[PDB]
Amino acid sequence: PGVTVKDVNQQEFVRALAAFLKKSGKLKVPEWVDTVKLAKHKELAPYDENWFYTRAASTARHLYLRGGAGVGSMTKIYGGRQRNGVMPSHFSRGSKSVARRVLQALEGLKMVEKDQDGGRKLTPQGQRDLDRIAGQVAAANKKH
Amino acid sequence: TEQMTLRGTLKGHNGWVTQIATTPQFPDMILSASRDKTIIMWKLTRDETNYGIPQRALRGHSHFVSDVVISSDGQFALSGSWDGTLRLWDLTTGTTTRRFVGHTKDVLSVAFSSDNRQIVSGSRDKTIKLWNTLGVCKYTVQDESHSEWVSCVRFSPNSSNPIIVSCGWDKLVKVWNLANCKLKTNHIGHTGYLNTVTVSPDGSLCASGGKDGQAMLWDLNEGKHLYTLDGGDIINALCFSPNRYWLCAATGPSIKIWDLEGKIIVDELKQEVISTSSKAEPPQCTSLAWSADGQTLFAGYTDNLVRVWQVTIG
Amino acid sequence: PDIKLFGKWSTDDVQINDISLQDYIAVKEKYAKYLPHSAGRYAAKRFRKAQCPIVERLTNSMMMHGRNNGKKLMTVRIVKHAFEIIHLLTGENPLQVLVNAIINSGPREDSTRIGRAGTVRRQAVDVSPLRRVNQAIWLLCTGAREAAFRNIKTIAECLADELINAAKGSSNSYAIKKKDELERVAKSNR
Amino acid sequence: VQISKKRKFVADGIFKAELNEFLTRELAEDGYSGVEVRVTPTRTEIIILATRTQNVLGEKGRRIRELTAVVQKRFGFPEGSVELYAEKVATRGLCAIAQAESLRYKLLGGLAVRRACYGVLRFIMESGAKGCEVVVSGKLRGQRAKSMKFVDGLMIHSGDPVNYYVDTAVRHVLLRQGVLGIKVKIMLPWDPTGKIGPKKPLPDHVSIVEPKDEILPTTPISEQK
Amino acid sequence: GPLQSVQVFGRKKTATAVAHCKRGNGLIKVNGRPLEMIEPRTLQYKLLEPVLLLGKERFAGVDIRVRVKGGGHVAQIYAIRQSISKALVAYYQKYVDEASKKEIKDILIQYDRTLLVADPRRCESKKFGGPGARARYQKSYR
Amino acid sequence: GRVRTKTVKKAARVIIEKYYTRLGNDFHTNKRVCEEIAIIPSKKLRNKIAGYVTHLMKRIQRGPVRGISIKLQEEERERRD
Amino acid sequence: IHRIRITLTSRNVKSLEKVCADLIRGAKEKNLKVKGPVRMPTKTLRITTRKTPCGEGSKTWDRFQMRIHKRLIDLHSPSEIVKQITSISIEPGVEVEVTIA
RNA sequence: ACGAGACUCUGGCAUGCUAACUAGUUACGCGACCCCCGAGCGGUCGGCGUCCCCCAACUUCUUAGAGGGACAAGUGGCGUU
RNA sequence: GGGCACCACC
Numbered sequence A: 001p002g003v004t005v006k007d008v009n010q011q012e013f014v015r016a017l018a019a020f021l022k023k024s025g026k027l028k029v030p031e032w033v034d035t036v037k038l039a040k041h042k043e044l045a046p047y048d049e050n051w052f053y054t055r056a057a058s059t060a061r062h063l064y065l066r067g068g069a070g071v072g073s074m075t076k077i078y079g080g081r082q083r084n085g086v087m088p089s090h091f092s093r094g095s096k097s098v099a100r101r102v103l104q105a106l107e108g109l110k111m112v113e114k115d116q117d118g119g120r121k122l123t124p125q126g127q128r129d130l131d132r133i134a135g136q137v138a139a140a141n142k143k144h
Numbered sequence B: 001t002e003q004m005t006l007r008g009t010l011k012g013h014n015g016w017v018t019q020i021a022t023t024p025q026f027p028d029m030i031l032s033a034s035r036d037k038t039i040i041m042w043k044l045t046r047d048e049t050n051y052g053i054p055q056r057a058l059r060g061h062s063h064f065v066s067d068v069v070i071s072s073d074g075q076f077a078l079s080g081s082w083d084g085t086l087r088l089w090d091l092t093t094g095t096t097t098r099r100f101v102g103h104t105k106d107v108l109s110v111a112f113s114s115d116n117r118q119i120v121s122g123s124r125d126k127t128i129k130l131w132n133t134l135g136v137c138k139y140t141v142q143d144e145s146h147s148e149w150v151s152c153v154r155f156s157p158n159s160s161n162p163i164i165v166s167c168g169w170d171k172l173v174k175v176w177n178l179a180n181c182k183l184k185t186n187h188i189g190h191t192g193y194l195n196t197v198t199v200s201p202d203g204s205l206c207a208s209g210g211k212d213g214q215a216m217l218w219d220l221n222e223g224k225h226l227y228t229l230d231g232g233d234i235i236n237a238l239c240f241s242p243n244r245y246w247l248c249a250a251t252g253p254s255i256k257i258w259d260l261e262g263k264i265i266v267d268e269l270k271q272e273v274i275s276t277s278s279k280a281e282p283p284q285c286t287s288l289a290w291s292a293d294g295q296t297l298f299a300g301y302t303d304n305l306v307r308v309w310q311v312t313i314g
Numbered sequence C: 001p002d003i004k005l006f007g008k009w010s011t012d013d014v015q016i017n018d019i020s021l022q023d024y025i026a027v028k029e030k031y032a033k034y035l036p037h038s039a040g041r042y043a044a045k046r047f048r049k050a051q052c053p054i055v056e057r058l059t060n061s062m063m064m065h066g067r068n069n070g071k072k073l074m075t076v077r078i079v080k081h082a083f084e085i086i087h088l089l090t091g092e093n094p095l096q097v098l099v100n101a102i103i104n105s106g107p108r109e110d111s112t113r114i115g116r117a118g119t120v121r122r123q124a125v126d127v128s129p130l131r132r133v134n135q136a137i138w139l140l141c142t143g144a145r146e147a148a149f150r151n152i153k154t155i156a157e158c159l160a161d162e163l164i165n166a167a168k169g170s171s172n173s174y175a176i177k178k179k180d181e182l183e184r185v186a187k188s189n190r
Numbered sequence D: 001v002q003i004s005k006k007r008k009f010v011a012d013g014i015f016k017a018e019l020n021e022f023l024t025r026e027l028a029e030d031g032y033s034g035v036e037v038r039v040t041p042t043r044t045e046i047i048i049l050a051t052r053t054q055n056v057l058g059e060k061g062r063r064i065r066e067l068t069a070v071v072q073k074r075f076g077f078p079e080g081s082v083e084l085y086a087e088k089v090a091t092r093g094l095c096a097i098a099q100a101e102s103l104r105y106k107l108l109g110g111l112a113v114r115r116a117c118y119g120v121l122r123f124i125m126e127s128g129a130k131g132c133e134v135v136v137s138g139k140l141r142g143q144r145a146k147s148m149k150f151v152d153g154l155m156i157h158s159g160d161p162v163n164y165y166v167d168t169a170v171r172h173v174l175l176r177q178g179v180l181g182i183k184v185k186i187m188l189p190w191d192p193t194g195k196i197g198p199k200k201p202l203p204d205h206v207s208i209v210e211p212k213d214e215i216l217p218t219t220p221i222s223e224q225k
Numbered sequence E: 001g002p003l004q005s006v007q008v009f010g011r012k013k014t015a016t017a018v019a020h021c022k023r024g025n026g027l028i029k030v031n032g033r034p035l036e037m038i039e040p041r042t043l044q045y046k047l048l049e050p051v052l053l054l055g056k057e058r059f060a061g062v063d064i065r066v067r068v069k070g071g072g073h074v075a076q077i078y079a080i081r082q083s084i085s086k087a088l089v090a091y092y093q094k095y096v097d098e099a100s101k102k103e104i105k106d107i108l109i110q111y112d113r114t115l116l117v118a119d120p121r122r123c124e125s126k127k128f129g130g131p132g133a134r135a136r137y138q139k140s141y142r
Numbered sequence F: 001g002r003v004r005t006k007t008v009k010k011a012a013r014v015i016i017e018k019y020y021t022r023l024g025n026d027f028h029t030n031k032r033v034c035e036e037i038a039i040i041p042s043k044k045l046r047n048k049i050a051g052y053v054t055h056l057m058k059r060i061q062r063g064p065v066r067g068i069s070i071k072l073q074e075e076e077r078e079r080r081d
Numbered sequence G: 001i002h003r004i005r006i007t008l009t010s011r012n013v014k015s016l017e018k019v020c021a022d023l024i025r026g027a028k029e030k031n032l033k034v035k036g037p038v039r040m041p042t043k044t045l046r047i048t049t050r051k052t053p054c055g056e057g058s059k060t061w062d063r064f065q066m067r068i069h070k071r072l073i074d075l076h077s078p079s080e081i082v083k084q085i086t087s088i089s090i091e092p093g094v095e096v097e098v099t100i101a
Numbered sequence H: 001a002c003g004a005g006a007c008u009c010u011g012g013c014a015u016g017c018u019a020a021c022u023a024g025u026u027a028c029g030c031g032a033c034c035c036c037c038g039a040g041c042g043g044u045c046g047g048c049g050u051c052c053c054c055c056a057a058c059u060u061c062u063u064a065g066a067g068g069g070a071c072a073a074g075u076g077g078c079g080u081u
Numbered sequence I: 001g002g003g004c005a006c007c008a009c010c
């Protein structure tokens, strides 16, 4: 009876993992987090000031599900639609300097490591942490 | 003085029932081939609601299934189809154990030997092929077997020299000698194409029929024409009673029983009550088989049904 | 087992009081489904849409205008919320409310036009039951749509109010007014 | 390096098209019919189909020895990989290109349009074709242009069988007062072999065989042999 | 304990879902995730319909794992339903009697025929002169 | 519409005239005989011809047809008349 | 003994399949081990153009299409036998490439 | 007789055939993680072997060849039947 | 006076 990541709801898992990363306090946060927007198709900066932890949690979860993703892959993952005035909308990618710093910060926690083929993947410690978080989420969901 | 009464009906098919096979080893099971590309194994309950229910469906044929025959021990089954291939199935698991390839047209008839070591098959390719169990065509016959399609091929279950009898759409009944595979006898008496040929359990008499509607009885060991019995429109199936010395012919709307000693009709089997449906043609009787017990006839019809007739003695 | 719409609204207690419309409203046992979403081919043949469940017909007719074409998940959610609101407001089965609203909203006598492009003259005719159901659904959806526009009020609340008023027979609803005016003009064109 | 398969096939097609155009312009006078390129890793062979090979060969083979030179100069592949051959067409009456050239040169010599067109039509029909059509368009008589049409036999227009049952040729001839246009269509006969016609029949032609004589049976006879 | 299993597929416009059904205890998963975690959850009942119609008793002896690919979200859900139903029917046909298969097939077909028979509809090609297959560009006079 | 062009009707009538003995009321046996005797370069055309042959055979069994006449039918009508 | 791959590229399928069958039969007559022929996905080149040489009339378009078919055959054998069987294989319209991996 | 139809390409069906490390599935080994209250013939894995000395089978899913399949054929009405 | 067509209407 062991809970894995795929068993629980993904949004609640992301919330719980972001809370765990914030409470840990060992994550490295850039200085410009409060003055930048996450992509060129965004109009405003993110509403949540603790958005870096949420993005790090999402990146860790994605590396859990599909390993070997680089900066370009993460940039494509978080890209979205761009509306440009009186012209038709088009797909647009995210900011590379945010994805790169999220990956570097996760590597600083010994949760993400360089992949032999290329890109980054999860360490056994990161997988253990994610499975523990999934178990906590499942227990909280069942108890209430 | 026996009356044949309809006992029940088996409904599992979606197409014309084409052949019915029985076996002495297992009286409680029947095997029926049909035009829905499926061979149904029927388990007989003899209950109130249903005389029998389907047990397993053998489905590996892409086209219609024409003929089906069980082995001596009732453990394997053989089948020919319109896709040009023969299939050998294990009845225990219902899985195809062997496939016979080599015919370029529809395989109309297939027959097992008396020892289950030789297999014969006639095709619309005007070709008769002889195979072994492993699936290798040991001998094909292009020696002027027939100028037209080969309808039925059967073995002779007699202690004497093994014989294979075939009927053609060229109005001919040919008799070939086994283990040498040479033409031994020709029979030219019919006016029209032939459908079925059968052999008596003694191995002495054979019956042939077709569109002309006359069942002609020939002598196998001597090689002469013996008798001719008039019947209905088209003779689809001919069978011999294993223990009663009878000849049962399957005509379109009805089934006729002849006593070979008296040449007198014993019974005619047909039923339809609805007056509105009289305009439409009654379903034809395609296939015919005797249970080894000798008391039940199984008749397969165009109506996608299998009807059982029970003998009542008086 | 028992099949309840959205898992909580049963169909056994619902009954249709109009003999004419019994054959064209599909709410009963063999038409009981869990969701108003089946991806069926009901437009392939004539009269086949009488076999489509009436909740799914409302859902199909709620995907207007062109800015809402094809968005059927949002429409299913809207119908679900509207049924919840109807149950809270009235206290009865929202399927019965929908059936009553459709029965009351369908015009019974119409007027057919013979018009030279400017001037038009008309003659009173009867309406088949299928057209009654179609026009009732169209009127209800149009009323809810016009109520929700440029107003701080959810589309589900407006749909619930329209359905409740139509089932009650009140003239506060768009469909009742439209039916009354159509029947008045038909009466005057006899 | 190497190029992709798409580019390779398009390049082969373009080379064949340019070779055909050059050979047409060079050998129109000799009844040039077609060109067939067979590519072998040893040498690339080119077969020239024309009505008469004597003019293509020239005296002592000079002219053909010239052509295989310029081709090598044009497309640039190395010497010794080029070899041209001349083969006469099996039946010249069933080729629309050769008939169009023949009509063009008859008109160029000053013959009457009607006489030459009827002669070409008669030759095509005598060769064994199902049918033929010849259209000549231009300033045949006067300042106003018109079109003359000569048809004979059968002819199909629509469908897929037009692709392999009809042979078409369009040509231009420059006369003193301007250009005339020539169109020739020939409908090939059905041939079980692929020599002078399509192998497959027309889709809607059904040939029902005559049944053979059968002896009426009278008495059951058993024959043993 | 013989190794008895069946793999059956189901299709929607471009979506294909293949279900592997073997002897087991009652596990049913899609891409490794439970049935209740598949999105969108608006159409969750469409995914639970075969289980609700047949009950957990008939699924209590098999493990089913589905792999989905292609199409959109709704098409993938409708493919998963059909794959589950057809896989259960094919398993009952081979490793149980024909009567149970007949009962299950009748129950499934009465509720919805698309649980066992695929929908042939596919997108129609665009023709030049208009935005799509049927629509044409706006014509003008004078 | 499902009207048959004169090609199918002519081919079916000629087949019934020449091979009345070999035909019957079964579409599949008829379509197997047609490819045996006739040369149809299309599968759809052969199916159409066989499907009209079956309809014509049923009509003949019901009674005389305005068009083709079978030698056996003529000889039988001689005995009838 | 080499692992040798034969790649066949053609524009029509009848000639390509005839050549593939000839190669398979020839190789198997020498009691050799053959894998394939494995058929790659067909390639479809498309060119859509306007019919009119000018810009007048209804806007009508021609859709020209070219299809390329590709086959693979694997053989465990020495070079000499492969060339023996390949020499016959020369066919008009089929490009045959022999490589040693 | 031409045109229309027929014809060619295309989209739907095949657990039947042919055969694939430039497509996969399943199974079996190795490994990572979770549950020591059920630790297991347990769950997740787009993590690594299984063709190339020897270390698995098979085409359901993917590709593309050969064939099948539908004809207003079956039933009931309406039609000059 | 009839027949047809969402480049006609309903």
Ligand SMILES: [Mg+2]
Residues within 6 Å of the ligand: A076, A077, A078, A079, A080
């Ligand atoms: Mg995105």
Ligand SMILES: [Mg+2]
Residues within 6 Å of the ligand: A083, A084, A085, A086, A087
């Ligand atoms: Mg904008």
Ligand SMILES: [Mg+2]
Residues within 6 Å of the ligand: C148, C149, C150, C151, C152, C153, C154, C155
């Ligand atoms: Mg509002």
Ligand SMILES: [Mg+2]
Residues within 6 Å of the ligand: D156
């Ligand atoms: Mg034509």
Ligand SMILES: [Mg+2]
Residues within 6 Å of the ligand: D158, D159
């Ligand atoms: Mg046409």
Ligand SMILES: [Mg+2]
Residues within 6 Å of the ligand: E123, E124
């Ligand atoms: Mg589209």
Ligand SMILES: [Mg+2]
Residues within 6 Å of the ligand: E132
């Ligand atoms: Mg569109």
Ligand SMILES: [Mg+2]
Residues within 6 Å of the ligand: none
């Ligand atoms: Mg396959």
Ligand SMILES: [Mg+2]
Residues within 6 Å of the ligand: none
């Ligand atoms: Mg309008």
